[PDB]
C-alpha cells in the first residue's frame, strides 16, 4: 500500500497545514444550515482531503465505504451514455465533465434522479445529504445554468460541493450562492513537515536538505512529493543530500524537448520537435500543462531581455489553443515563433 | 399561369448541360452504352446535378421511367422505416427492362439524410446492383459517409466558369428577345457566383421587375452591397486610409445593410482584387476574423471600423 | 341565458368524435335558429360546418347571440362523461367564462354537472355560397368508411371519378393499384343501403386520404352520406344529423400534374 | 385600449409610407397575376408583415381569407416536421372557394435549419402555379442560396 | 422553523416599503387610473426588490382573490428551456377568465406574467421569448426582471418600458447590518461593516450572504478582516504590495516567484485583475504606465473569460507591469 | 401441505388484474380461516386487504400457517393461460419453493399443470383497527369505474363530499370542473342498481385519482361497491367477491394545503 493515501488525515484536528481554515470549516459544519460549497485552489493542494474530511465531520462513521455505480442516460439523439458514480450510503460523488457535449443531459437527469430519491430513515442521520461535483470547471455554459437551477430547486434537500481549479471559466452566478472555500498549496516548510512525519512514522531518517529538494522539485504538490519520497525509498534507503531524485518521464521529456529547441533554429529541428510534441500530445496530457512545462523549462535558458516577449507569446498561444480545437497547430506555432525570435536574438 | 424560367429552360438531353464537360461526355457514353455504375454527383448548387441525373435516367429508361425510376427527395420523409421499406422494396421489385438499361433510384440531397438511413442504404446498393443503380445528388460530401463515396463513383461538379453561363444566358435571352446592357449581364454574373439557377432567376426576376437588363435594375431587385463601393473600400484600405473608407462604410450602414451581407461582399470582392499576394492573404485572414466576430453575435458598426483599422495597419 | 336540452345524447358524442382529431379549437355561433359551427383545420384544407336546429332540442331558449370559443379536446373528455342514453342540458351565461353540461339518467336517478373553461378566439365566418353540383351521390356510411379504410392502405390519395357507369374510387401506391367501382342499385329493401347517383357532367378529382379517414368517423350519425362533387367545387360530404341538423365537410382537391408518359 | 403599435398597423396600401417601390412592384405583380414567391428581408419593425397582410386582404375578401392564406411563424415548433405537415398540405391542394393561387406567410423565416430550408425549397419547386409563398426574415445570410434562387 | 436566508426574508413587502422608489409607485399609480400599460422590464442590482415590488403591484391591480388566478410568476433561470417558454405561457394565455371582479371595481382585461432573472437566458431562448411576447400581445402582459441591460437582447428590450432600480446607495446599509447583528447577537466592529459594504459594488444581497457566511464560520466569535477577506473573494492587500514590489524592479526570477506564489495561494486571476486594476487606477503612476497596465488587465480578463490558463497570463501581465514599472 | 380447488376460476383472474398494477409483489398468508393478502404499495399511499373465505372453495386442505410471497405480474401471466370456466387447483407444500397451478376443464378433457418459482419477502402486518365509520355509500361498481375514469380526465384529484343531499364527487383542472351528485334511490328493480347512504356526519375529503383508477379494476368482481368514509381515517372501498370473500382498499386522503 502507498503511504501517499495510507497516512491520509481523517479528522479535522490531524491536518498538518491550514489549521485556521480547518477550524473555520469545523465551526461552519458544527451548526446547521450547511450551505453550498465551492472549493478551489491549485492542483495537489489538498482540496479532496478537505472534502472527505468535511464529509467525515458532517456524518458519522460510515464515510469511506465507497463503491462504483453505473447509470445510463439518454440524449435528445437516441443514444445511451453510461456514466460512472462514486457513492456511499451518506453522499454522492460524480464527475460530470466526462460527457463532453451531453453535459447538460447528465446535469439535468442524474441530479434529478438523486433528488427524486428519498433518504431512507432521514430522521436518524441528518437533514440533507451532499453531492460532490469533482471536475466542475470545464462544464459548458448551459450545463452550469442547469447546475445552478439544480442548486436552486433542491436547496432544502440537496446541497452541492463543487471542486475545481482556475475558477475563471466557472460562471459568475454559481459563485454568488456558493460559499467559496479556497485551499492554498502548502508551503515548503509544511511539505517538509509532513514528509518528516511520514518518514518518522515509517522508521526513516530523512535529512532536511533532501526534504527541501523534494519540496522545491514537487512545485507545491504534496501527492507528487510523497510519490517522490516513496520512489526515493525504493531507489536507495541510505538517504544522502546529493541524491538523484527520480523525476517523471514527461518533465524530463519536456526538458529534452526544450534543449532540442534551443540547440538549433532550423525547420528540420522544427520537424523533430513537432514529432516530440506529437509524442507528448498522444499521451492524453493537457496542452496547457505542456505549455506550462515548456515555459518553465524554457525560462532557465533564455536571456533576461527576451523572457518578457517569450512569456507574452506563451500566453497568446495558450489562449488561442483554448479558442481552437486542435492543439498541435498552436503548439508548433509557439515553438516556431520562439525559434524565429531566438535566431533574431543571436543573429543581431 | 406561365412556368418560371428555372423549370422552363431545364435541359431535356444530356448535351445541353454545360457543367463539367468530361463528366457530361462520360455520362453520355454511359447513356448510349447502358451499364451505368453507381454514381454520386457533388458540387455547389446550380451546376446542374439534378438535370444531369434526370436526363441520364430519361435517356436510359425512356417509356419505362414511371416504374423503373424512384425519385426520393428532401421534402419526403427519410426515416429508418423509409430506407427499410420504400428503397428496399423498390430495389427488390421486377421491371421488364432491356439488356443494358437498369433501374435508377434518384437520391437527391443525400447529405441531409441521417446516419441510419445511409446504414440501410449501403447494403442495398451493394446487393441489388445487378438491377438498380444509385445516382446520388449532394452539395457537400462531408455529411455523407466515406463508404457510400467508396462504393459509388464520385463526380465532382465544379462551380461554373462564367463563359458557359454567358452562353446559356444568350440562349435564354435570344429565346425571349429581352433587351440588355452588357455590364448589367456581368452584374448578373456577379450576383450568380457559380449558381446558374440563381442567374436565371435573377434575370427572370429582374426583367419582370424592370424592363431593360441594366446594372441598376438587377442591383435594385437584389440590393446587395455594390461591387464598386466595396472595391473602393478595399482600395482605400490598401493605401492605409481609415477615413475615406469610413465614408463608404457610413454610406453602406445608413443604407440599412446588415453586417453579415457587408462582410460577405467584402470577402467576395477581396477574393478577386488586384493586390499583392501576401497582402491578400493577410487581408483574407483579417476579414475571416471579423466574420467570426459577426457570426458569434457582435454585429456593430464598430466591428466594421475595427476591421478597417486592422486592414489599414496591416498595410504598414 | 343559454339553456338547451337534448334528449338523444350520444348523437352529440358522435358529432364530437367527428370533430375529434380533425380540429382542436372551434367557435360556436348561437342564435335563435340554434347552434352553428364553422371551422377549418390547422392546415386550412378541410372546412367543417355543423348546424343544430332549434326544434331538434327538447327545451331551447336563447335571448342573445353568443360567440363561444371551445377546445374540442376538453369537451372530448367531458362528453365521454355523458352516457349513451343520457339527457344533455347545456347552460351558459351571456358573459360567461364557464360552460355547464348536465347529464341526466333516463330514470332521473343520476345527475351530473360538468364545467368547461372557455377560451377567446378570432372568428372568420367564411360564408359558403349555394352552388349547383355536377354530381350528387348518396351511399351508405359504413360503405364509404370501408372504402377509405381499404384505399388508405394502398396509397395516400384517392382518385374519385363519377361517370355514367357510376362512381370509381382509385388508389396508386408503392404496393400497387386499386380500383373499386360502384353502380346505381335499382332495388334495396331499405332506403339506407342504396347507392343513388344524380348527374350533369362526369367529374374526376383527387383527394388526400388522411382527411377522408378523419371525415368518415361520422359514420353512426347518419345511415346515408351525400357526396356532392363537381369540377372547381370542393368535395361536399353531407351527413343529415337526423331531424335536428346537418354536418357538412369541404375538401379541396389535390393538384394533379399532367404528364404525357 | 391597446398599445399604439397594434392600433395603427397600416391596413391600407395608402396608409404605409417610405416603401413605395415595394408597393409599386408588388401591385404591378398582383394586378397582372405575375407574383412570384416573395422573400421579405430587412431590419425589425420596418413593416414586413403589414404590407403582405394588406396585399392579401386586397386580393381576397374577409369571407374567403381563411382558405387562401395560411400564416405560420416560429412561435410554433419549427423544423422538419411542420414542413411535412401543414405547409405542403396547404400548398398541394386546390381552393375551397372560387379559383386562384394561395399564400403561405412565414414570419421570421431565418430561424429554421438548412434541412428544413431544403425541404421547403423542394416544396416551392413542386407546387408553384397554385401556391405563392411569402417568407419574412431578418437576415438574408441565414438562408441557403438555392432558396434565394427561388423566391425574389 | 427552517433557517431562512436573510435576503428574501428581509426584502420589502408592500408598495411603499421600497425605500424611496416612489417613481415606480407613481408610474403605476398613473396606470391605475389609465387602466392600460405596455410590457415592463425592471433592471437593477439584486436585493433591491423588483420582484416584491411587482408582486405588491399586481396585488394592487388585481386583489388577493385574482392574484393566484391572474398573475403567473416564473423564474427565467429556472425555466431556461425553450419548451416551457413556448408551452406554459401559451397555456396561461389560452385559459382566459373575464376582467370582472366580485367587488365591483373596474379591472383591465389582460393577464400578468412575470419572468425573473431573464438576463441569464441565451440568445435563442430570448428570441423565443420575443416570439412569445409577439404572439401574446393582446391577452397577456409581460414584465421582466434583470440585473444588466445588454444581456437582454435588443429585440427583447425594444418592446418594454425600462425602469432602473436604485438600491440603498450609501450610509443606510451600515446601520441596517448593525440592526441585523444586534438582532441575531452578532459581534462585528465598524471596520468589518465598512469592509462588508466595500467588497460588494452596490450589492446588498452579496453583503447579507457574506455576513451569513462569516457568522456561520465564526459561530459567535469576532468577525475580523481575515474571515471577510476569505469569504468575499478578496486577495489580501499585502499580496498586492508584494506583487508591486517584485514587479517594480529586479529580475524575472522574483516575478516567477510571486506569480507561482499567487497561483499556489488559490487566488483567482480575475480577482487579481480587479484588485490590481483598483490599485493602478488610484495610485500615482504615469498615464502611459497606467494605460498600458490597464489595457493588458482588460485583455487578460478577456482571455480568462474565454477559458485560458491563468498561470501563463498572470506571468505575461506581471511581465508587462515589470516592463512598465522598471522603465 | 396446502391444496385448494375452486370451481369458478375467472374470479381469481379478475382479482389478478385488480391488483397486478397496484402492487408488484404480494405475500399470501394462508391459515385455517383462509387466504389473506395485506399488502402495501411502493409509493407509500395505499393499503390492500384481499381475503378469500374457506367455505366458498370446493375443497381445501391446509396443514400449517403459510406465507408465500409471489410476484403478481408473472402469476398474472400464468393465469392468462387459464380460461374463464376452468376449475383451478393451487398446490404448495409446507416448505414450498414452488407453486403448482392446475387448470382443469369442466368436461375434464384438458388438465394443465404449471410451476411457479417462489421468493422470500420480509412482511410487516399492519393491524387494521375495528372502528365505526361515519358514512357508508353502496353503489354500482360499473358506475364507480365510470366515475373514476370520467373524473380522471379532468384533474389529478377529487374532493368528494357526502351530506344529507347524498354523495358528491368534485374534480378541478385546467380543462375545468366536474361535479357529479347521487341521491338515495327509493324504488329499484334490482338491488345491485340501488344507491344506499348510511349517515352519521357530513364529511368532505380529497383523494388522488390514480389510485382510484387502480382500484376500479375490481369492478367485474362485484355488482356493488361500498365507499366508507370518516374523519382523519383512510377511505375504505370495498368489493364483495361473491360470497367468496372481500376486497378492501385503504386510501390515504390528501391533506396538502397551499
Ligand atoms: N449546366 C447547366 N446548363 C444549363 N442550365 C443549367 C445548368 N445547371 C443548371 N441549369 C438550370 O438551372 C436549373 C436548376 O438546376 P438544378 O440541377 O436543379 O440545380 P442543382 O444542381 O440541383 O443544385 P441544387 O439542387 O439547387 S443544390 C435547371 O432547371 C436549369 O434550367
Ligand atoms: N412603413 C410603415 N408605415 C406605417 N407604419 C409602419 C410602417 N412600417 C411599420 N409600421 C408600423 O409598425 C408596426 C409593426 O409592423 P410589423 O410589420 O409587424 O413589423 P415587422 O416588419 O413584421 O418586423 P418584425 O415582425 O419584428 S420581423 C405596424 O403595425 C405599423 O403600425
Ligand atoms: N495533512 C496531510 N497529511 C498527509 N497528507 C496530506 C495532507 N494534506 C494533503 N496531503 C496529501 O496531498 C495530496 C493532495 O491531493 P488532493 O487532495 O487530490 O488535492 P487536489 O484535489 O488539489 O489534487 C493528497 O494525496 C494527500 O495525501
Ligand atoms: Mg438537387
Ligand atoms: Mg411582424
DSSP letters spanning A112-129: HHHHHS--TTHHHH-S-E
Co-location of B203 and B248 in the same domain: no
CATH class of this structure's domain A19-182:
alpha beta
The verdict on residue C176 lying in a domain is yes
**F2 in helix, strand or coil?**
strand
Closest atom of ligand 2 to CA, residue D4 = 31
Q: How far apart are the first and last CA of chain C?
A: 64
Query: Contact, C180 vs C171, CB < 8 A?
Result: no
The answer to whether residues B290 and B235 belong to one domain is: yes
Among all chains, which residue has been given the C-alpha cell 466591428? B303
Q: Which ligand is nearest to the CA of D71?
A: 5
The strand order across the sheet containing E71-75 reads E71-75, E111-116, E140-146, E39-43, E160-164
Q: Can you tell me the distance from the alpha carbon of A11 to that of A52, in angstroms, rounded to the nearest whole number?
A: 9
- Residue D3 to residue E128, Cβ atoms within 8 A: no
- Sorted by sequence, the CB contacts under 8 Å of residue D104 that are 6+ apart come out as D69, D70, D71, D72, D87, D90, D91, D131, D132, D133, D134
On whether both B15 and B131 belong to a single domain, the answer is yes
* C142 falls within a domain: yes
| Residues E21-49 as b or e (16 or more Cβ within 10 Å = b) | beebbeebeebeeeeebbbbbbbbbbbbb
The answer to whether residues C6 and C84 touch, using CB atoms and an 8 Å cutoff, is no
The verdict on B45 and B72 lying in the same domain is: yes
Place of cell 426576376: B205
**CATH code (residue B260):** 1.20.272.10
Say how far apart CA F88 and CA F3 lie, in whole Å. Answer: 10
User: What domain count does chain D have?
Assistant: 1
What DSSP designation does A13 have?
G
User: Is C76:F154 a contact under the CB 8 Å cutoff?
Assistant: no
Long-range CB contacts for residues E60-65, cutoff 8 Å, separation at least 24: E60/E15, E60/E28, E60/E32, E61/E28, E61/E32, E61/E107, E61/E108, E61/E112, E62/E101, E62/E107, E62/E112, E63/E101, E63/E103, E63/E105, E65/E101, E65/E102, E65/E103
Angstrom distances, CA of residue B267 to CA of B117, B193, B260, F136? 37, 13, 11, 85
Packed helices E287-305 and E269-281: angle between N→C axes, nearest 10 degrees: 160
Work out the widest C-alpha separation in chain D, in whole angstroms.
45
CATH number of the domain to which B125 belongs: 3.40.50.300
Interruption sites in chain D after residues (C→N beyond 2.5 Å): none
Contact B233, B266 (CB under 8 A): yes
* Chains near E (3 or more Cβ pairs under 8 Å): A, C, D, F
User: Which residue numbers come right before each break in chain F (C to N over 2.5 Å)?
Assistant: none
Determine the angle formed by the axes of helices B242-254 and B301-314, rounding to 10 degrees.
150
CATH number at residue C17: 3.70.10.10
Q: What is the DSSP string of A23-71?
A: HHHHHHHHSS----EEEE-STTSSHHHHHHHHHHHHS-STTS--EEEEE
Q: What is the 3-state secondary structure (H, E, C) of chain C?
A: CEEEEECCCHHHHHHHHHHCCCCCEEEEEEECCEEEEEEECCCCCEEEEEEEECCCCCCEECCCCEEEEEECCHHHHHCCCCCCCCEEEEEECCCCCEEEEEEECCCCCEEEEEEEECCCCCCCCCCCCCCCCCEEEEEEHHHHHHHHHHHHHHCCEEEEEEECCEEEEEEEECCEEEEEEECCCCCCCCCCCCCEEEECCCEEEEEEHHHHHHHCCCHHHCCEEEEEEECCEEEEEEEEECCCEEEEEEECCECCCCCCC
Under an 8 A CB cutoff, do B209 and D152 touch?
Answer: yes
- For residue B66, which residues of chain C lie inside 8 Å, CB to CB? 259, 261
Give the count of beta carbons closer than 10 Å to the beta carbon of residue A254: 23
CB atoms within 10 A of CB C20: 15
Considering only CB atoms, which chain F residues are within 8 Å of C114? 176-179
3-state secondary structure of E305: helix
Helix (H) or strand (E) holding F169: strand F166-173
The grid cell for F25 is 409483489
Q: Say yes or no: B243 and B107 in one domain.
A: no
What's the domain range around B180?
A: 161-224
Q: What is the CATH number of the domain that holds D21?
A: 3.40.50.300
Atom of ligand 2 nearest to the CA of E155: 26
Closest CA to A258 of A287, A292, A285: A292
Task: Say yes or no: A295 contacts chain E, CB-CB below 8 A.
Answer: yes
Give the integer Cα–Cα distance in Å for A251 and E11: 56
Cβ neighbours of residue F66 closer than 8 Å, sequence gap 6 or more: F2, F29, F30, F92, F94, F96
Q: Is B45 annotated as a binding residue?
A: yes
Helical packing angle, E190-199 and E173-183, nearest 10°: 120
Candidate from C44, C47, C125 with C-beta closest to D70: C44
Pairing state between β D131-137 and D102-106: parallel
CATH of the domain at B167: 1.10.8.60
CB B14 within 8 A of CB B56: yes
Residue A39, classified by CB atoms within 10 Å of its CB into exposed (0-12), middle (13-18) or buried (19+), is buried
Rounded Cα–Cα distance for residues D52 and D22 (Å) = 10
Let me know if residue C261 belongs to a domain: no
D20-31 and D48-59 helices cross at what angle (nearest 10)? 30
Chains in contact with A, counting 3 or more C-beta pairs less than 8 Å apart as contact: E
SS3 at position A275: helix
Contact criterion met (CB below 8 Å) for F125 and F27: no
Ligand 5 geometric centre to CA of D48 (Å): 6
Q: How close C219 gets to chain F, by Cα (Å)?
A: 24
What's the domain count of chain F?
Answer: 1
Using CA atoms, how far apart are residues C108 and F186, in angstroms rounded to an integer? 12
Q: A5 Cβ partners below 8 Å, 6+ apart?
A: none
CA of D40 to the centre of ligand 2 (A): 13
Identify which of A223, A226, A230 to mutate to test ligand 3's pocket (most ligand atoms within 8 A of the CB). A223
Sheet containing B39-42: which strands, arranged edge to edge?
Answer: B69-72, B103-107, B132-137, B39-42, B153-156
> In chain D, whose CA is at the least distance from the CA of B79?
D80
Give the Cα-Cα-Cα angle E112, E117, E118 (nearest 5 degrees).
Answer: 75
- Closest by Cβ to D150, choosing from B201, B221, B258: B201
Crossing angle of helices E50-62 and E22-34, in 10° steps, is: 30
**Would the CA dihedral through B52, B56, B57, B62 be positive or negative?**
positive
d(CA B57, CA B41): 14
The domain locations on chain A are: 19-182, 249-347
Provide the shortest C-alpha distance from residue D124 to chain E (in Å): 25
Q: How far apart are CA B24 and CA B17, in angstroms?
A: 7
> Residue B152, CB half-sphere, CA atoms under 13 Å: how many?
29
Resolution, angstroms, 1 dp: 3.2
* Distance from chain centroid for Cα F54: 18
B245 and B284 in a single domain? The answer is yes
Domain-ending residue, one of B224, B240, B268: B224
Q: Any idea which residue has 461591387 for its cell?
A: B227
B79 and B130 inside one domain: yes
Minimal C-alpha gap between B39 and chain C (Å): 25
Q: Which residue of C has its CA nearest to E94?
A: C119
Question: Residue with C-alpha cell 414511371?
Answer: B66
Q: What is the DSSP letter of B158?
A: P
| Cβ-based neighbours of D4, under 8 Å, separated by 6 or more | none
A191 lines ligand 3 (CB under 6 A): no
Report yes or no: C254 at the D interface, CB cutoff 8 Å. Answer: yes
Helix/strand/coil for B68: helix
Distance CA B279, CA D135 (A): 41
Q: Is the CB of A250 under 6 A from ligand 3?
A: no
- Give the integer Cα–Cα distance in Å for D50 and D11: 7
Q: Do chains E and C touch (3 or more CB pairs under 8 A)?
A: yes
Separation of alpha carbons A39 and A48, rounded Å: 9
How far is the C-alpha of E157 from the C-alpha of E161, rounded, in Å?
8
User: What number of C-beta contacts closer than 8 Å exist between E and F?
Assistant: 3
Question: Nearest CA to E66 among E13, E108, E34?
Answer: E108
Beta-bridge mates of residue B303: none
Q: Look up the domain containing F22 and give its range.
A: 1-256
CATH of A249-347, one of 3.40.30.10, 1.20.272.10, 1.10.10.10, 2.40.40.20: 1.20.272.10
Going by alpha carbons, the residue nearest to atom 8 of ligand 3 is A46
Measured distance CA(C224)–CA(D9) in Å, rounded: 49
Specify burial of residue C62 (Cβ count, 10 A radius: 0-12, 13-18, 19+). buried
Q: Reduced to 3 states, what is the DSSP secondary structure of residue A139? A: coil
- D74 near B CB under 8 A: no
Asked if F148 and F139 count as a contact pair (C-beta separation under 8 A), the reply is no
CA distance C88 to C102: 6
What's the Rg (C-alpha) of chain B?
Answer: 24
Helix (H), strand (E) at residue B146: helix B146-151
> Do C40 and C48 form a contact (C-beta atoms < 8 A)?
yes
Amino acid at each position: 500500500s502507498l503511504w501517499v493515501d495510507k497516512y491520509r488525515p481523517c479528522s479535522l484536528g490531524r491536518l498538518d497545514y491550514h489549521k485556521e481554515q480547518a477550524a473555520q470549516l469545523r465551526n461552519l459544519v458544527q451548526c446547521g444550515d450547511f450551505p453550498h460549497l465551492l472549493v478551489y485552489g491549485p492542483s495537489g493542494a489538498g482540496k479532496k482531503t478537505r472534502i472527505m474530511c468535511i464529509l467525515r465531520e458532517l456524518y458519522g462513521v460510515g464515510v469511506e465505504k465507497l463503491r462504483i455505480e453505473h447509470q445510463t442516460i439518454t440524449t435528445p439523439s437516441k443514444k445511451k451514455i453510461e456514466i460512472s458514480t462514486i457513492a456511499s450510503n451518506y453522499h454522492l460523488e460524480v464527475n460530470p465533465s466526462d460527457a463532453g457535449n451531453s453535459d447538460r443531459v447528465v446535469i439535468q437527469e442524474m441530479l434529478k434522479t438523486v433528488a427524486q430519491s428519498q433518504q431512507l430513515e432521514t430522521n436518524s442521520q441528518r437533514d440533507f445529504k451532499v453531492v460532490l461535483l469533482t471536475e466542475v470547471d470545464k462544464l459548458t455554459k448551459d450545463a452550469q445554468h442547469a447546475l445552478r437551477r439544480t442548486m436552486e430547486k433542491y436547496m432544502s434537500t440537496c446541497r452541492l460541493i463543487l471542486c475545481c481549479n482556475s475558477t475563471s471559466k466557472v460562471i459568475p452566478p454559481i459563485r454568488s450562492r456558493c460559499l467559496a472555500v479556497r485551499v492554498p498549496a502548502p508551503s515548503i516548510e509544511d511539505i517538509c513537515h509532513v514528509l518528516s512525519t511520514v518518514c518518522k512514522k515509517e522508521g526513516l531518517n530523512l535529512p532536511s536538505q533532501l526534504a527541501h529538494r523534494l519540496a522545491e522539485k514537487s512545485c507545491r504538490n504534496l501527492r507528487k512529493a510523497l510519490l517522490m519520497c516513496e520512489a526515493c525509498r525504493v531507489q536507495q534507503y541510505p538517504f544522502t543530500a546529493d541524491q538523484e531524485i527520480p523525476e517523471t518521464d514527461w518533465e524530463v521529456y519536456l526538458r529534452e524537448t526544450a534543449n532540442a529547441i534551443v540547440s538549433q533554429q532550423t525547420p528540420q529541428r522544427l520537424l523533430e520537435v513537432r514529432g516530440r510534441l506529437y509524442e507528448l500530445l498522444t499521451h492524453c496530457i493537457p496542452p496547457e500543462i505542456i505549455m506550462k512545462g515548456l515555459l518553465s523549462e524554457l525560462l532557465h535558458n533564455c536571456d533576461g531581455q527576451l523572457k518578457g516577449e517569450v512569456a507574452q507569446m506563451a500566453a497568446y498561444y495558450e489562449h488561442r489553443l483554448q479558442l481552437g480545437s486542435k492543439a498541435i497547430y498552436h503548439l508548433e506555432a509557439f515553438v516556431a515563433k520562439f525559434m524565429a525570435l531566438y535566431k533574431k536574438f543571436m543573429e543581431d | 399561369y406561365e412556368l418560371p424560367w428555372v423549370e422552363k429552360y431545364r435541359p431535356v438531353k444530356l448535351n445541353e448541360i454545360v457543367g463539367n464537360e468530361d463528366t457530361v461526355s462520360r455520362l453520355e457514353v454511359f447513356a448510349r452504352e447502358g451499364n451505368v455504375p453507381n454514381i454520386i454527383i457533388a458540387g455547389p448548387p446550380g451546376t446542374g446535378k439534378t438535370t444531369s441525373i434526370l436526363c441520364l435516367a430519361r435517356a436510359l429508361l425512356g417509356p419505362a421511367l414511371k416504374d423503373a425510376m424512384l425519385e426520393l427527395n428532401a421534402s419526403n420523409d427519410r426515416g429508418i422505416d423509409v430506407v427499410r421499406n420504400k428503397i428496399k422494396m423498390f430495389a427488390q421489385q421486377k421491371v421488364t427492362l432491356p439488356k443494358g438499361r437498369h433501374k435508377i433510384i434518384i437520391l437527391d440531397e443525400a447529405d441531409s439524410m441521417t446516419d441510419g438511413a445511409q446504414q440501410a442504404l449501403r447494403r442495398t446498393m451493394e446487393i441489388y446492383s445487378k438491377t438498380t443503380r444509385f445516382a446520388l445528388a449532394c452539395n457537400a460530401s462531408d455529411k455523407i459517409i466515406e463508404p457510400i463515396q467508396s462504393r459509388c463513383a464520385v463526380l465532382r461538379y465544379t462551380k461554373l466558369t462564367d463563359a458557359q453561363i454567358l452562353t446559356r444566358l444568350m440562349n435564354v435571352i435570344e429565346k425571349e428577345r429581352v433587351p440588355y446592357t452588357d455590364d448589367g449581364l456581368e452584374a448578373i454574373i456577379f450576383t450568380a457566383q457559380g449558381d446558374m439557377r440563381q442567374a436565371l432567376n435573377n434575370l427572370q426576376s429582374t426583367f419582370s421587375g424592370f424592363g431593360f437588363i441594366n446594372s441598376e435594375n438587377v442591383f435594385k431587385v437584389c440590393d446587395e452591397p455594390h461591387p464598386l463601393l466595396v472595391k473602393e473600400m478595399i482600395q482605400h484600405c490598401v493605401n492605409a486610409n481609415i477615413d475615406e473608407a469610413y465614408k463608404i462604410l457610413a454610406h453602406l450602414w445608413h443604407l440599412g445593410y446588415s453586417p453579415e451581407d457587408i462582410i460577405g461582399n467584402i470577402f467576395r470582392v477581396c477574393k478577386t482584387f488586384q493586390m499583392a499576394e501576401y497582402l491578400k492573404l493577410e487581408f483574407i485572414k483579417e476579414i475571416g476574423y471579423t466574420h467570426m466576430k459577426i457570426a458569434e453575435g457582435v454585429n456593430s458598426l464598430l466591428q466594421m471600423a475595427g476591421l478597417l483599422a486592422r486592414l489599414c495597419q496591416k498595410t504598414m | 341565458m343559454f339553456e338547451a336540452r337534448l334528449v338523444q345524447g350520444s348523437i352529440l358524442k358522435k358529432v364530437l368524435e367527428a370533430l375529434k382529431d380533425l380540429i382542436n379549437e372551434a367557435c360556436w355561433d348561437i342564435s335563435s335558429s340554434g347552434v352553428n359551427l364553422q371551422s377549418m383545420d390547422s392546415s386550412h384544407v378541410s372546412l367543417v360546418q355543423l348546424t343544430l336546429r332549434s326544434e331538434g332540442f327538447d327545451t331551447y331558449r336563447c335571448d342573445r347571440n353568443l360567440a363561444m370559443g371551445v377546445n374540442l379536446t376538453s369537451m372530448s373528455k367531458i362528453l365521454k362523461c355523458a352516457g349513451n342514453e343520457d339527457i344533455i342540458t347545456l347552460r351558459a351565461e351571456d358573459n360567461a367564462d364557464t360552460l355547464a353540461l348536465v347529464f341526466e339518467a333516463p330514470n332521473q336517478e343520476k345527475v351530473s354537472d360538468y364545467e368547461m373553461k372557455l377560451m377567446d378566439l378570432d372568428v372568420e365566418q367564411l360564408g359558403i355560397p349555394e352552388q349547383e353540383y355536377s354530381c350528387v351521390v348518396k351511399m351508405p356510411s359504413g360503405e364509404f368508411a370501408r372504402i377509405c379504410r381499404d384505399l388508405s392502405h394502398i396509397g395516400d390519395a384517392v382518385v374519385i371519378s363519377c361517370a355514367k357507369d357510376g362512381v370509381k374510387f382509385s388508389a396508386s401506391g408503392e404496393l400497387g393499384n386499386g380500383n373499386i367501382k360502384l353502380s346505381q342499385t335499382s332495388n334495396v329493401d331499405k332506403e339506407e343501403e342504396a347507392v343513388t347517383i344524380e348527374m350533369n357532367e362526369p367529374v374526376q378529382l383527387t383527394f388526400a386520404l388522411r382527411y377522408l379517414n378523419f371525415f368518415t368517423k361520422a359514420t353512426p350519425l347518419s345511415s346515408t352520406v351525400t357526396l356532392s362533387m363537381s369540377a372547381d367545387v370542393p368535395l361536399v360530404v353531407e351527413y343529415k344529423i337526423a331531424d335536428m341538423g346537418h354536418l357538412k365537410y369541404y375538401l379541396a382537391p389535390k393538384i394533379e400534374d399532367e404528364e404525357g408518359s | 385600449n391597446l398599445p399604439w403599435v397594434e392600433k395603427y398597423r397600416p391596413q391600407t396600401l395608402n396608409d404605409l409610407i417610405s416603401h413605395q417601390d415595394i408597393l409599386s412592384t408588388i401591385q404591378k405583380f398582383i394586378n397582372e397575376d405575375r407574383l412570384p414567391h416573395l422573400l421579405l428581408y430587412g431590419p425589425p419593425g420596418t413593416g414586413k408583415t403589414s404590407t403582405i397582410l394588406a396585399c392579401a386582404k386586397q386580393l381576397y375578401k374577409d369571407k374567403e381569407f381563411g382558405s387562401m392564406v395560411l400564416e405560420l411563424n416560429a412561435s410554433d415548433d419549427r423544423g422538419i416536421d411542420i414542413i411535412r405537415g401543414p405547409i405542403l398540405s396547404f400548398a398541394s391542394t386546390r381552393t375551397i372557394f372560387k379559383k386562384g393561387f394561395k399564400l403561405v406567410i412565414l414570419d421570421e423565416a431565418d430561424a429554421m435549419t438548412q434541412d428544413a430550408q431544403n425541404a421547403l425549397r423542394r416544396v416551392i419547386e413542386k407546387f408553384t402555379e397554385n401556391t405563392r409563398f411569402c417568407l419574412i426574415c431578418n437576415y438574408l445570410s441565414k438562408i441557403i442560396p438555392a432558396l434565394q434562387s427561388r423566391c425574389t | 422553523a427552517k433557517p431562512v436566508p436573510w435576503v428574501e426574508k428581509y426584502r420589502p413587502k408592500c408598495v411603499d416599503e421600497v425605500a424611496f422608489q416612489e417613481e415606480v409607485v407613481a408610474v403605476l399609480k398613473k396606470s391605475l387610473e389609465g387602466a392600460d400599460l405596455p410590457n415592463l422590464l425592471f433592471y437593477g442590482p439584486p436585493g433591491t426588490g423588483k420582484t416584491s415590488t411587482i408582486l405588491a403591484a399586481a396585488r394592487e391591480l388585481f386583489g388577493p382573490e385574482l392574484f393566484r388566478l391572474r398573475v403567473l410568476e416564473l423564474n427565467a433561470s429556472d425555466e431556461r428551456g425553450i419548451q416551457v417558454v413556448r408551452e406554459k405561457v401559451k397555456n396561461f394565455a389560452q385559459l382566459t377568465v373575464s376582467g370582472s371582479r366580485s367587488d365591483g371595481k373596474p379591472c383591465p382585461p389582460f393577464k400578468i406574467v412575470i419572468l425573473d432573472e431573464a438576463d441569464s437566458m441565451t440568445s435563442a431562448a430570448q428570441a423565443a421569448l420575443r416570439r412569445t411576447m409577439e404572439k401574446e400581445s393582446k391577452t397577456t402582459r409581460f414584465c421582466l426582471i434583470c440585473n444588466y441591460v445588454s444581456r437582454i437582447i435588443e429585440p427583447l428590450t425594444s418592446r418594454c418600458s425600462k425602469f432602473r432600480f436604485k438600491p440603498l446607495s450609501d450610509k443606510i446599509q451600515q446601520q441596517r447590518l448593525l440592526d441585523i447583528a444586534k438582532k441575531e447577537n452578532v459581534k462585528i466592529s465598524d471596520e468589518g461593516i465598512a469592509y462588508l459594504v466595500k467588497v460588494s459594488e452596490g450589492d446588498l444581497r452579496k453583503a447579507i450572504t457574506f455576513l451569513q457566511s462569516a457568522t456561520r464560520l465564526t459561530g459567535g466569535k469576532e468577525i475580523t478582516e481575515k474571515v471577510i477577506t476569505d469569504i468575499a473573494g478578496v486577495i489580501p492587500a499585502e499580496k498586492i504590495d508584494g506583487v508591486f514590489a517584485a514587479c517594480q524592479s529586479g529580475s524575472f526570477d522574483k516575478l516567477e516567484a510571486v506569480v507561482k506564489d499567487l497561483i499556489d495561494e488559490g487566488h483567482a486571476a480575475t480577482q487579481l485583475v480587479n484588485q490590481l486594476h483598483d490599485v493602478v487606477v488610484e495610485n500615482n503612476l504615469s498615464d502611459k504606465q497606467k494605460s498600458i497596465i490597464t489595457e493588458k488587465l482588460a485583455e487578460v480578463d478577456k482571455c480568462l473569460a474565454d477559458g485560458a490558463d491563468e498561470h501563463l497570463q498572470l506571468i505575461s501581465l506581471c511581465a508587462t507591469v515589470m516592463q512598465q514599472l522598471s522603465q
